[PDB]
Design an enzyme around this catalytic site. Sequence first.
Site, PDB file in Angstrom:
ATOM      1  N   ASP A 282       0.846  -1.185   0.000  1.00 24.15           N
ATOM      2  CA  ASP A 282       0.000   0.000   0.000  1.00 24.15           C
ATOM      3  C   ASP A 282       0.888   1.243   0.000  1.00 24.15           C
ATOM      4  O   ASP A 282       2.121   1.169   0.066  1.00 24.15           O
ATOM      5  CB  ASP A 282      -0.971  -0.012   1.190  1.00 24.15           C
ATOM      6  CG  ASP A 282      -2.279   0.746   0.898  1.00 24.15           C
ATOM      7  OD1 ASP A 282      -2.274   1.698   0.072  1.00 24.15           O
ATOM      8  OD2 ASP A 282      -3.320   0.382   1.497  1.00 24.15           O
TER       9      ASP A 282
ATOM     10  N   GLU B  42     -11.143   6.116   3.457  1.00 17.62           N
ATOM     11  CA  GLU B  42     -10.113   5.594   4.385  1.00 17.62           C
ATOM     12  C   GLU B  42     -10.365   6.185   5.776  1.00 17.62           C
ATOM     13  O   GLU B  42     -11.529   6.327   6.185  1.00 17.62           O
ATOM     14  CB  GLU B  42      -8.718   5.854   3.827  1.00 17.62           C
ATOM     15  CG  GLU B  42      -8.542   5.437   2.372  1.00 17.62           C
ATOM     16  CD  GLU B  42      -7.090   5.524   1.908  1.00 17.62           C
ATOM     17  OE1 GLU B  42      -6.185   5.220   2.710  1.00 17.62           O
ATOM     18  OE2 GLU B  42      -6.862   5.902   0.739  1.00 17.62           O
TER      19      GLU B  42
HETATM   20  O1  LIG Z   1      -7.081   0.903  -1.399  1.00 23.25           O
HETATM   21  C1  LIG Z   1      -5.821   1.513  -1.260  1.00 23.25           C
HETATM   22  C2  LIG Z   1      -5.539   2.432  -2.435  1.00 23.25           C
HETATM   23  O2  LIG Z   1      -5.034   1.677  -3.522  1.00 23.25           O
HETATM   24  C3  LIG Z   1      -4.521   3.484  -2.006  1.00 23.25           C
HETATM   25  O3  LIG Z   1      -3.262   2.869  -1.914  1.00 23.25           O
HETATM   26  C4  LIG Z   1      -4.462   4.634  -3.007  1.00 23.25           C
HETATM   27  O4  LIG Z   1      -3.665   4.264  -4.114  1.00 23.25           O
HETATM   28  C5  LIG Z   1      -3.922   5.932  -2.398  1.00 23.25           C
HETATM   29  O5  LIG Z   1      -4.477   6.192  -1.115  1.00 23.25           O
HETATM   30  C6  LIG Z   1      -4.244   7.075  -3.356  1.00 23.25           C
HETATM   31  O6  LIG Z   1      -4.140   8.319  -2.695  1.00 23.25           O
END
Ligand SMILES: OC[C@@H](O)[C@@H](O)[C@H](O)[C@@H](O)CO
Length: 579
Positions: free
Chosen positions: A274, A469
């Site tokens: 991530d 998030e």
């Molecule tokens: O689900 C997670 C997502 O892939 C995250 O890694 C995004 O790429 C990032 O937060 C973009 O700002």
Amino acid sequence: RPAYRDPRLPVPDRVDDLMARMSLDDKLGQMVQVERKAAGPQAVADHRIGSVLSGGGSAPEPNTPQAWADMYDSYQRAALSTPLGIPLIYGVDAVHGHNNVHGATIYPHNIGLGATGNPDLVQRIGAATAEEVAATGIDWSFAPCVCVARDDRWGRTYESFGEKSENASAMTSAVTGLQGEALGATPSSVMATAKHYVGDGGTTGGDDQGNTEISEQELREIHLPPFREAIARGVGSVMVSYSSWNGEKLHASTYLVNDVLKGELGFTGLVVSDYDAIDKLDGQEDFTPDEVRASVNAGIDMFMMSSRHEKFIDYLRAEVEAGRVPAERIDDANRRILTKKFELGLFERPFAQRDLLPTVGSAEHRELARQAVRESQVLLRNDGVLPLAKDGGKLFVAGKNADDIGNQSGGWTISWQGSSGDITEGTTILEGIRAAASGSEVTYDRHGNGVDGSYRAAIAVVGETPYAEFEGDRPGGLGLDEEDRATIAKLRASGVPVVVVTVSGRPLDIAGEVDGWNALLASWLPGSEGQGVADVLFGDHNPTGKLPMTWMRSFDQLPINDGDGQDPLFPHGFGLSYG
Ligand SMILES: OC[C@@H](O)[C@@H](O)[C@H](O)[C@@H](O)CO
Ligand SMILES: [Mg+2]
Ligand SMILES: [Mg+2]
Ligand SMILES: [Mg+2]
Ligand SMILES: [Mg+2]
Ligand SMILES: [Mg+2]
Ligand SMILES: [Mg+2]
């Protein structure tokens, strides 16, 4: 003449030949995925970087489908000019359509898709999404979230197909739609990503990036099965979670990532981190050499970072030089990354497929989305007010979610968090109501002002505004805010029958008020085609959706899940129809 340039050669032989020609520095570069704001095309090529992503909201100017394709081709031209000419792979969050792109079709978020109980529909959405992504050249979507959301306080509950492993596992059909049966077989094949591995829906308190404190049995029985199904469907990539399992960070878990995912589950694809996830291992900003070492040795193949690509490469080189990261670990990561690049056809067809640009936001894709809106609606209460007639009597519409493309789309829509307003092309719920009741006067006021007893029904479209998030975690409560409750009370005071429509990413705490509502329809986050809501309200679609999460009697019951013995307001699988 190099065998890796032979397009008739089996992929593993092409991979072997290319890797035989790569320096260690070439191999380190392939393990980097850098966010586009940190490195333009030339810098990506200069460092032999393997991948670029657009983070949420990270669009070129202007934000058009053509400009995305231009941006992609610009990065690819530079990557193709390096000594080996290894094409770039580009990743993006296309999690309910190609949602960063203005004018792309915006599909219901996963929770509503789970409510449809229709895996074939989710597969068709995967295929339509893949077409709109491939039109921009981008090769790889960070989708689907196969997260099993067990605590509604979580800000990503709406990205989950449901609280039961059955739910998410069945909806990994999204993988088959995005990729096709074989990755790279058709021109619209786009690599899918099962995320986030593993237990992101199980964190204590539904805290995003939190700690999932459960037995290995519970982890394997609840959270693991959707990953197994996605792997069986051939998912090309798995993304690791920010969260922890019993206090162990997933991004350092050799056991879960190498031993269980790659080993026991036999995953042969690309494991990606991530976003700046290795930075968070020690709880302090930025990444250290220790965090690089721990995460590479955990078995992750590609590292998603917002910047500092040169520092990552320098750190990893030193770890490999010192033998703290074994040479075979770098080779394993490269074999997995390069295999997917060959399978995706990037060495033969590296550029955007502009023949597909007319599909972006096309009528056929919006019709598919509208059908998903329809099927995602869950009828929870109805005293007879629904379906509303198309008879001609005045209707009243109110609510902050009644006439707002961005609110009805929720997070991950153009921007990362989403936003309110007319942020992309689509039809609002109020516009769908006006068109359904095409012979009726339809009065709209956000706050219910002007409603009176002369109206035949009042519709209050309430609920949440967009989030994504951790910004969407709700430890404080899930009741309706004061505007929603004031507006519903104003409508009920008119004596007119009141239909309440929740636009939300999750169940909301409504048990104290629901008995006063003549009807309750849960709409989730339906996306750009708001007219599918009116389809159900007016009986064009007899509601078929069922609850994918158990609906609380009280915030105090969270986490609440099917089979936990708690008495819910509405159980998992509940849904009324017109009879
Ligand atoms: O689900 C997670 C997502 O892939 C995250 O890694 C995004 O790429 C990032 O937060 C973009 O700002
Ligand atoms: Mg199509
Ligand atoms: Mg492509
Ligand atoms: Mg939080
Ligand atoms: Mg750190
Ligand atoms: Mg519009
Ligand atoms: Mg639940």
